[PDB]
Structures are given as C-alpha cells and as structure tokens.
C-alpha cells in the first residue's frame, strides 16, 4: 500500500535526532565518496583558481533509517534531507561554491532497506589552486580539490573513495580550451590540527598547457621584428634617414607589441619566461640601433667593417639566445 | 546509550532564552578568539581592499549550557547554533563577506561539561584597507581587520586573544605573488562611540611589494628609450631627417608607454612614484629634441660644441636624476 510507505517513513523520522551522529558513542561512520565531473569550465591564471561542476555522492550507513517490508529503495524528495543527519563534508580550496537550485534544489536522498543512505548533490565550485607561472606559457600545473569534514574528527567520521581508483568519473571526457588533463590522482590521508586529527580526500589533476597558439601569436612577431632590425644593417651606412627610421620604427613596434601582450597576458605581477623573451628581443633591437650610432660616430669621427661584424654577430648572438631560452624552459 | 544524550540536549535547550546573554545582570562575559588564515586571495589597489579567508573560532562560558554525566565533549551539528546565544561579533572594515556553505553551513558548535562553548566559522571577507600609493610600486602597505562587538558594550562583553600572540596562525599560508608579509600584529583595545564603549581586536599585516616585475616591465623600457634619445647626439648635425625622426619617434614611444601603462596598471587617480620617473624620462626625451632644434637653428640660422656638451651632460644629468630618485624612495 502507498499509505504503508508513508507510515514507515513517519516512523523512521519520528524520534530522529538530526544533531546526533550515527552511533554517537560507537565507532566512526565510514562515508564513501564518489564524484562525476560534468565540466571544468575556467582555469583562471589571473585569479589562480578553476571552476568545476560535479555530481558529488556520499554513501553511509544509519541503523536508525533501516526499514523492512518495502523491497524497493525509497527515493524520497530532496526536502527530506532537512530532517536527516548528513555528513559534515566541505571543500578547503573553494573560493565560492554553490549547489544548483533550479526547479528544485539539486539533491537526492536514496534510502535502502539495509539502512545505507545515498546523498547526491550537484555542486559548482571555484577551487583555488596555485600556478607556478615562472615557466609560463610552458608550464605543468597541478590543481587539486580537497575534501574534509569541518566538525567531526577521525574518531567520529571516516572517509574513503568508493570504488577505489574508479571513484571519480568524467575526467576522460572533459576537454579544456588551453590545457590538457594529463593525469588525475586520488589520495586519502589524515591531517592533524589543534582540535584533532581529521580525515581528508584529495582529487588532484595535472594540467599541461597546450603550446600551439603562443608561438603562432607571441614569439613570431617579436622574432620577425628583430629580423627586420637586422635588415637595418644591410642598408648602406651613409643613408642615415633610412637606417635610423627603420631602427626606431622597429623599436616602436616592439614597444607596441610588449604593451599589447601585457594587455593580453595573465597579468600576474611577477616575472615569466615570455617577459624574458620579449625583453631580450627589445634589447636586441635597441642594440641594433645603437650599433648604427657607433657606425655613424666612427665614420664621421673602417665603418663597413663594423657593419659586416654586426651582420655576422647579431643573427648568431640571437640564435644563441634562442637556444639558451628554449633549453632552459624545456 | 544514545537516547540519554538526546534528553540531555533537550533539557539543556529547555528554558534557554537566546535573547539574554550569559550573566545578563552579572559581570561581562569573556570571549576568546582565534583565527586561522587559510589565505589572502586578492589585494586590489583599485578597490583598496583585500579578500581574506579564515577559520574564525570564538570561545566563551555559558553556565546555562552545563551538563553532567557525559564526560566527553559534545561536538554538535551546526544547526544547533540556531538555538544558542552567540557573541554577535562583526568586522568594522568589511565591504562584502559570507560564510562558506557548500554541503553544510560551515559552522561548528562544541559544548563542554562545564558550560564552555567553542563556536567556529569559515568566513570570507573583502575587508577595506586604505593604501598610501605615493611610493608605488616602491611602497609598503598596512592592512588591518577590526573585530568588534556591535550590540554589547565593554561592560556587557570582553574580548581577548586566546593564546596571546599565538592566537592567530596560518600567516605562513599567506602567499601573495606581488607582496610579502614582513610582520603581523595583534592589538586589543576599547573604542568609544555615541552609544557606549566597545571592545576591539585588531589583526594587522605589513606587506612589502616585490618590484622585480615593475623594474622589468616599466622602468627599463623608459630608460632604453632615453638612451635611444641620447643616440641622436652622436649621429650628425646636418642629417636633419634622421635626427628629427629619431627624436620625435622617441617622444611618440614615451607617450605610448605612458598611455599603455596607465590603462594596464591599477587605476588609482593621484600622483605616484612611477609617474614622477616617467615624466622625468619624458622631459629628457623632449629636451633632446629641443637640443637638436637649437643646434639646427644655430647651424642653418659651434654646432659640434653644443653636440659634445650635450654628449657629456645628458647621460650625467640622467644618472643624477636616477641617483636622486632611487635614494629618495629607498
């Protein structure tokens, strides 16, 4: 009968204290975690965080919620979650998180005759992960989600990944615009505080930046402008107007390039590899113009010898600089 | 075994009036406070604020909540905090704030047999600290959090740092790319308003800005452009096209640099140390072009003498300007 299920549920909830952990004096409750990643939307370098949407399921056991005579698993309305005890799980990394709430609060309570309870939530979390952008844009980030209980120590609650390494699903399918998820790892541990030792789970992704876009847009304009700065040398040294105009316009173009990549870079105030490369190229064009300064000073007060010396040295020096840069940052 | 705790909790909250603080007519209630700084996410000079995430623990004595026969501490669910009195603390210098609420309201209540209550929250606060950016980016800032009691005067409540200087922990966890904490400080005092005298606890941090990024990105290009302006002296005096193009294009490059650091650096509308350096460099570049104009008027309308004098003066004057600048601000 349908009313029989209503009476069973009312009996289960009657005399139920939400404030008391299951087996309040007994051993700790073993909560099995499970995640299905729906999307990792943003990976913000400027904010040094990433947005992640997940179906987060928690399985545990409550003898108070055991029932008999109803063979089915009672899938109840989400509002019943208010009247039950649920674990004290929270994320440490989250700058801002929320449970999706449209048309209902996106929660599920599924009871079972054995007493085991499944509690599922659709959660979007802006987790904070540090990024070592010293080698930017050739870097290997490692962004993690940390799961812990706020109130209950390891003596009261116990966490584990349900399904072992198969606990987390969806990493294989999710694709990022600017990164590739090389690997994901599941870790379980205990962390000691002043209050006590708490359980912890950790889902750590390793992200490798895809490099087929910065070379197309960042390095090549600077390299070609430096090459034009070298083209300055092959012009005859008596044509002061032509050489000076070429050199100073190349300097202006490099300044524009630097300013607008600063506008279109992550804009984190500390030095990165791309900054070093851009300043190297800027110093190269500046030295190219100062070379003609030397040439004009010497000729009016041989000079073609200096021009040939520059012709052989500047491409070679820049090739050496490029080799050093591309070996150091690889 | 488990019900007995239920009647203990029920009789604890039976006859308990949250509207009255402990010892309503008696002496003031002492509230100790601890803070564990998870991180300082941002320090914005545009908005003159910083975002701080922390575990904020309060600790006080409530004789109405004393229980016997259960020697263990009762770590109750966060919802129990709705039925208890709490110190009504706030932060004076807040702009926008919240308590993290992913999967549970991140709060903890722990009762002790002697009536002692330990309350705990996980709070993100966008606190306001005004910054004196006259020395920017060579500046040192001081940002503070001002914990205070709103409704209860000094004769109703008393604040102190639990553990003294050890009350605040996790400053090691603070990791700002463009700042480094040189010191943190705790202060306790009283502040008088029209409604009465209230207790105040101040948590202050001194932050020193790292200037590697600024030196690399703003100072050096403006110096290289000034050197290129000096290069005009060595060229000639009759090659008017080359020298004029060099000088005016250097002026254009300085204006471009100033505009594109204005529109990319944080927007604080008043004078700063970097602005003085940039305008000094602009003045030097402008005076190089005026020097060539004077030379051209003298020659067409001794020119080599003026060129030599400018050669042995402009680098010297710029070095003097740098020495004055880099000693005033350091």
């Amino acid at each position, epitope marked *: 009968n349908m009313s029989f299920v209503k009476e069973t549920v009312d009996k289960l909830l009657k005399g139920y204290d939400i404030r008391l952990r299951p087996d309040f004096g007994g051993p700790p409750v073993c909560v099995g975690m499970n995640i299905d990643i729906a999307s990792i939307d943003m990976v913000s370098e400027v904010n040094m965080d990433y947005t992640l949407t997940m179906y987060f399921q928690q399985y545990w056991r409550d003898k108070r919620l055991a029932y008999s005579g109803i063979p089915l698993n009672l899938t109840l309305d989400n509002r019943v979650a208010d009247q039950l005890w649920v674990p004290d799980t929270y994320f*440490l*990394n989250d700058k801002k998180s929320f449970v999706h709430g449209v048309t209902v609060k996106n929660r599920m309570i599924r009871l079972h005759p054995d007493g085991t309870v499944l509690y599922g939530l659709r959660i979007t979390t802006t987790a904070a992960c*540090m990024m*070592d952008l010293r080698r930017y844009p050739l870097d290997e980030q*490692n962004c*993690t989600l*940390e799961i812990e209980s706020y109130g209950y120590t390891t003596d009261d609650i116990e966490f584990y990944w349900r399904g072992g390494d198969k606990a987390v699903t969806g990493v294989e399918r999710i694709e990022l615009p600017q990164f590739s998820i090389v690997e994901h790892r599941l870790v379980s541990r*205990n*962390v*000691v*505080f*002043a209050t006590g*030792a*708490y359980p912890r789970l950790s889902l750590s992704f390793r992200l490798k930046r895809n490099i087929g876009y910065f070379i197309l847009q960042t390095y090549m304009p600077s390299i070609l402008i430096t090459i034009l700065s070298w083209v300055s040398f092959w012009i005859n040294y008596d044509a002061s107007a032509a050489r000076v105009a070429l050199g100073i316009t190349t300097v202006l173009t490099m300044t524009t390039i630097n300013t607008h990549l600063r506008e279109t870079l992550p804009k984190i105030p500390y030095v990165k590899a791309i900054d070093m490369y851009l300043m190297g190229c800027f110093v190269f064009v500046f030295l190219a113009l100062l070379e003609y300064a030397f040439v004009n000073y010497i000729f009016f007060s041989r000079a073609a010898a200096i021009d040939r010396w520059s012709r052989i040295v500047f491409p070679f020096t820049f090739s050496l600089f490029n080799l050093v840069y591309w070996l150091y940052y690889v | 075994n488990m019900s007995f705790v239920k009647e203990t909790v029920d009789k604890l909250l039976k006859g308990y009036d949250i509207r009255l603080r402990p010892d309503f007519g008696g002496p003031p209630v002492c509230v100790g406070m601890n803070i564990d700084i998870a991180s300082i996410d941002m320090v914005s000079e545009v908005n003159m604020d910083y975002t701080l995430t922390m575990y904020f623990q309060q600790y006080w004595r409530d004789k109405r909540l004393a229980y016997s026969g259960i020697p263990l501490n009762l770590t109750l669910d966060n919802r129990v905090a709705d039925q208890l009195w709490v110190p009504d603390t706030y932060f004076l210098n807040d702009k926008k704030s919240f308590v993290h609420g992913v999967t549970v309201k991140n709060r903890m209540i722990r009762l002790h047999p002697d009536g002692t209550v330990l309350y705990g929250l996980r709070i993100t606060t966008t606190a306001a600290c005004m910054m004196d950016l006259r020395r920017y980016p060579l500046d040192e800032q001081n940002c503070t959090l001002e914990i205070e009691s709103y409704g209860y005067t000094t004769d109703d409540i008393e604040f102190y740092w639990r553990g003294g200087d050890k009350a605040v*922990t996790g*400053v*090691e*966890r*603070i*990791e*700002l790319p463009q700042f*480094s*904490i040189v010191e943190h400080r705790l202060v306790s005092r009283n502040v008088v308003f029209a409604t009465g005298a209230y207790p105040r606890l101040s948590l202050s941090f001194r932050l020193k800005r790292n200037i590697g990024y600024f030196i690399l990105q703003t100072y050096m290009p403006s110096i290289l452009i000034t050197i290129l302006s000096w290069v005009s002296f060595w060229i000639n005096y009759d090659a008017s096209a080359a020298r004029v193009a060099l000088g005016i294009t250097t002026v254009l490059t300085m204006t471009t640099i100033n505009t594109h650091l204005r529109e990319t650096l944080p927007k604080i509308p008043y004078v700063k140390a970097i602005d003085m350096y940039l305008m000094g460099c602009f003045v030097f570049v402008f005076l190089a072009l005026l020097e060539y104009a004077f030379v051209n008027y003298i020659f067409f309308s001794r020119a080599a003498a003026i060129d030599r004098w400018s050669r042995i003066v402009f680098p010297f004057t710029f070095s003097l300007f740098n020495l004055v600048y880099w000693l005033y601000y350091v």
Partner: nanobody, 105 residues
Framework: LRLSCAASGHTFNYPIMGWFRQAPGKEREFVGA????????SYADSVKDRFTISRDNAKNTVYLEMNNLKPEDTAVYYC??????????????????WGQGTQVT
C-alpha cells in the same frame, strides 16, 4: 654553529620546510618552519630566540643557525617538507617527505 638543508624537485608543491628534533627518549618535536616563498618563519617556544631559520631560494636551501647551545640540544635533526593544504606546522604526521637525520651534541 650552522646547519643547512637543500631541497630539489617539485619544490612548489611543498612550500613549507620544517625542522624537527628527536632525542633518544622523546619523540619527534617541532623546532621551526619556513616558507619557500616569502621567507616567513615560525619557531618553537624553547628555541624562539636561540635558533633561527632563514631561506636562500637561489640554491633552494634553508639555513638553521644555532646559538647559545645547551646539552639538552643534543639530538638528531630532521628536515621535512609539507604540502600546501596539510594542517598545522607542529605535527610531524602532516609532513610528507622526510630527510636524513643529522646527529648533533
């Protein structure tokens, strides 16, 4: 006296370097801690002023300088590294990688 600990590898993932001490009788105790970035130092009460920990990131090293030596300082010292999210500094369990001990007397 002077002692040092050099670290290499994924230093970014483990920014905090902890110095611990162990005598033959007592267990591992906390001596000090230093951040790899910012050079912020934390000390134990007993060695708050006698010992100092400093940072040198060019060589990726942490230097423990010892002054006002007592015979009670006779012990083995351990260099360890802690993850970004691993709780308090004072607990050896939170520290993942443990260096080889150095006996001093």
């Amino acid at each position: 006296l002077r002692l040092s600990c050099a670290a290499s590898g994924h230093t970014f993932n483990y920014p905090i370097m902890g110095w611990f001490r162990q005598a033959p009788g007592k267990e591992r105790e906390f001596v000090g801690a230093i951040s790899w970035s910012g050079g912020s130092t934390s000390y134990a009460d007993s060695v708050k002023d006698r010992f100092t920990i400093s940072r040198d990131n060019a060589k990726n090293t942490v230097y423990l300088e010892m002054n006002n030596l007592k015979p009670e300082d006779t012990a083995v010292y351990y260099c360890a590294a802690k993850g970004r999210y691993s709780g308090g500094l004072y607990y050896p369990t939170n520290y993942d990688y443990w260096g080889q001990g150095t006996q001093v007397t």
